[PDB]
Amino acid sequence: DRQVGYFADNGVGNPLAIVQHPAGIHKNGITYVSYQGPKEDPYIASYNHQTGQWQGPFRAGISELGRRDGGKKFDNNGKPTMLIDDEGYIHIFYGGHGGQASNGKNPLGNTHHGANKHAVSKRPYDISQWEDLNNITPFGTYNQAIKMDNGDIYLFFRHGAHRSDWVYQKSVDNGRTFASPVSFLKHKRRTDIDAVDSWYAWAGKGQGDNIIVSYDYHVCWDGGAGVNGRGHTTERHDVYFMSFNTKTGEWSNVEGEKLVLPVTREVADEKTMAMRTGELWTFNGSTHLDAQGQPHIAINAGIDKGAKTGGPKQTRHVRWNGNEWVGGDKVIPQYERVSRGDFMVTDPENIRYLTTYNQDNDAVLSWWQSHDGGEHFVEDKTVLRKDNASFAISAFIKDAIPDAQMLVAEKVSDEGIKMYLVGEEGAVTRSLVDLKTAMP
Ligand SMILES: C[C@@H]1O[C@@H](O)[C@H](O)[C@H](OS(=O)(=O)O)[C@H]1O[C@@H]1O[C@H](C(=O)O)[C@@H](O[C@@H]2O[C@@H](C)[C@H](O[C@@H]3OC(C(=O)O)=C[C@H](O)[C@H]3O)[C@@H](OS(=O)(=O)O)[C@H]2O)[C@H](O)[C@H]1O
Ligand SMILES: [Cl-]
Ligand SMILES: [K+]
Ligand SMILES: [Zn+2]
Numbered sequence: 001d002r003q004v005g006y007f008a009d010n011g012v013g014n015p016l017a018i019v020q021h022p023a024g025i026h027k028n029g030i031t032y033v034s035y036q037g038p039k040e041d042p043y044i045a046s047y048n049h050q051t052g053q054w055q056g057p058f059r060a061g062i063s064e065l066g067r068r069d070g071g072k073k074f075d076n077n078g079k080p081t082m083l084i085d086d087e088g089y090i091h092i093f094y095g096g097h098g099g100q101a102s103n104g105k106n107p108l109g110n111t112h113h114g115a116n117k118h119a120v121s122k123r124p125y126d127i128s129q130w131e132d133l134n135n136i137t138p139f140g141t142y143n144q145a146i147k148m149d150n151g152d153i154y155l156f157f158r159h160g161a162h163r164s165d166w167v168y169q170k171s172v173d174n175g176r177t178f179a180s181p182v183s184f185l186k187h188k189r190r191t192d193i194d195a196v197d198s199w200y201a202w203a204g205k206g207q208g209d210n211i212i213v214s215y216d217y218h219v220c221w222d223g224g225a226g227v228n229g230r231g232h233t234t235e236r237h238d239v240y241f242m243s244f245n246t247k248t249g250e251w252s253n254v255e256g257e258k259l260v261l262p263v264t265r266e267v268a269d270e271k272t273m274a275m276r277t278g279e280l281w282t283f284n285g286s287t288h289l290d291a292q293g294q295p296h297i298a299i300n301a302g303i304d305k306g307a308k309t310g311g312p313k314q315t316r317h318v319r320w321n322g323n324e325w326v327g328g329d330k331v332i333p334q335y336e337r338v339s340r341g342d343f344m345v346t347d348p349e350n351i352r353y354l355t356t357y358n359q360d361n362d363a364v365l366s367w368w369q370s371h372d373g374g375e376h377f378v379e380d381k382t383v384l385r386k387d388n389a390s391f392a393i394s395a396f397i398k399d400a401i402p403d404a405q406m407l408v409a410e411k412v413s414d415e416g417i418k419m420y421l422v423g424e425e426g427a428v429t430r431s432l433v434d435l436k437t438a439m440p
Helices: 265-271 432-438
Strands: 008-011 024-027 030-036 042-048 053-059 081-084 090-094 117-121 130-132 141-147 153-158 166-171 182-185 195-205 210-221 236-245 273-275 281-289 295-302 314-320 325-330 339-345 351-359 362-370 378-386 390-393 406-411 417-422
Touching: 008 030, 008 042, 008 053, 024 081, 030 081, 030 406, 030 417, 042 090, 053 432, 081 141, 090 141, 090 153, 141 195, 153 195, 166 195, 195 281, 210 281, 210 295, 236 281, 236 295, 265 273, 273 295, 273 314, 273 325, 281 339, 295 339, 314 351, 339 390, 351 390, 362 390, 362 406, 378 406, 378 417
Parallel strands: 314 339
Antiparallel strands: 008 417, 024 030, 030 042, 042 053, 081 090, 090 117, 117 130, 141 153, 153 166, 166 182, 195 210, 210 236, 236 273, 281 295, 295 314, 314 325, 339 351, 351 362, 362 378, 390 406, 406 417
């Protein structure tokens, strides 16, 4: 037997992403981790930090996205999101890419395929057996699950495919019943161009009873519209910020001005814009408050090179300094390829990304540190590096301890993808004999 760096070897497509978060959660010395496995089904494992023993991975549910007739080989937009409720049941949200006509008429957007799903562990703190609840709307993409101190659960998602509002559904009974969706970002026809307002949001905990939300805007072009009829692309621009007080129900911008829901593009441009990116195309990151309560934002952006996705995009850091939004500088200086990363912030000046990037054909995951509020980052220790690969990463694990902070997927082909749990220094190893016994 020997220790290997990966805890599973069956990921497919993009098995992780920052937008489906938490992908893993730490509680009482156990780190729970989830990712997308064969047929895009959600898999979950756990690591017991005191005993050194892994459990799983176990399949938590059955995704429609892995059983489509044709189309893209892997969809990936329904990789799993995790939450542990106040009774210890583990919830997995997964499988949605906006539903389809068989689920009903989507009242808050359009559809594509794959009904959004909700599984729960049969017993508290036991990841081995699962049951379907599917008590949320099937018209969902991009699950983001937040539990407040009183146990209330907010599930944020897009209520359909591109041309849909973003919403949350709230549960006060540990995820067993959800209230109807509440729209907080509006999709609608533009009155100036042949496009629909569309959005991508990242919601996470703020301080107290606040939830904070960063988002970029998608210019959702009609077919044949746009410059020289380029049609529908992934064109996205800019980044915005607002806050949600879960005690009062009210939303506000960084200055505390209250917003009427759902927020339209026109109000967002007036009230919640954080950083314009000009002609640069964006891919959203995440947001976190510093120790003075001021929001920091990771936003990826890059030059449009004419591709359907524009071109490669690099992570940039933005922050509220108490009076104005500042920043926009790249985390990795002079880098022009693809980078992604999540960050931690303490004092407003002190920001650390764990970021992935490529050097030649190799994948790198390393820490980058700023002490000047995000204008300059310097690379510190490398946590994982793999030749002839690229990394998909999770957001930082909820309540992470130093040994287990982020999940990584070593993309080589689009199946058989090795899955890693990494900490300050490197991977949380698993016995190979144990892994082979457990797989799948
Ligand atoms: C649901 C949409 O239905 C139709 O309108 C159409 O098929 C559309 O495709 S599109 O014209 O290319 O936009 C469908 O949209 C896809 O699903 C997503 C959605 O918003 O519904 C989108 O995916 C996000 O953005 C992608 C760029 C990303 O894809 C990864 O990253 C890149 C890249 O940066 O070049 C390329 C690969 O597609 C993939 O590695 C998605 O990530 S995921 O983990 O694969 O899910 C996701 O973040 C997007 O609009 C379409 O892919
Ligand atoms: Cl990119
Ligand atoms: K990502
Ligand atoms: Zn679109």
